[PDB]
Amino acid sequence: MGHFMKPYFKDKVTGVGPPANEDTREKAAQGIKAFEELLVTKWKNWEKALLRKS
DNA sequence: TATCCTAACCAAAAGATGATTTGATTGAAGGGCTTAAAATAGGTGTGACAGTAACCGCTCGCTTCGGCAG
Numbered sequence A: 001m002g003h004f005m006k007p008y009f010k011d012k013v014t015g016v017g018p019p020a021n022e023d024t025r026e027k028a029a030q031g032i033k034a035f036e037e038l039l040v041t042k043w044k045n046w047e048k049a050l051l052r053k054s
Numbered sequence B: 001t002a003t004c005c006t007a008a009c010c011a012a013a014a015g016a017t018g019a020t021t022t023g024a025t026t027g028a029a030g031g032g033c034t035t036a037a038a039a040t041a042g043g044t045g046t047g048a049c050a051g052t053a054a055c056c057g058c059t060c061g062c063t064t065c066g067g068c069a070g
Helices: A020-031 A045-053
Strands: none
Touching: none
C-alpha cells in the first residue's frame, strides 16, 4: 500500500523515473518552479558544527 | 460592537534533535586445504593398442524397322 507513493510508477530494478517530457521541458525553459523546491531544512547544531569544521 | 493581530501562551500539524533498538556488518575461530620431498605396500579399469567394420558452337559414327526385291 505504501509502495505507491510518488512517483507512482518507479523502476523496480533501479528506482529511476521516466525521462523528461515535452511539457516539463517547456516548463523548465520557461523557468516555472515546482512544489518540491519549497522543502527547506533548518540548520541543526550538528550541521553548523560540521560546516565550521569544513 | 464583528472582527482580527500574534506580544505570551494552549492545541495540533510539521519540523527538528538526541537516546535507544533492531537490521546489518564483520573479527576471529571451527575448519580443512596447498606443493615439496621420501616411502613401502598394494587393488583394477581403462585406455591405448590393434584389427576388421560399416556406412556413407560445330561436324562425323552408329543403330533400327520397314518398302520394295527375290
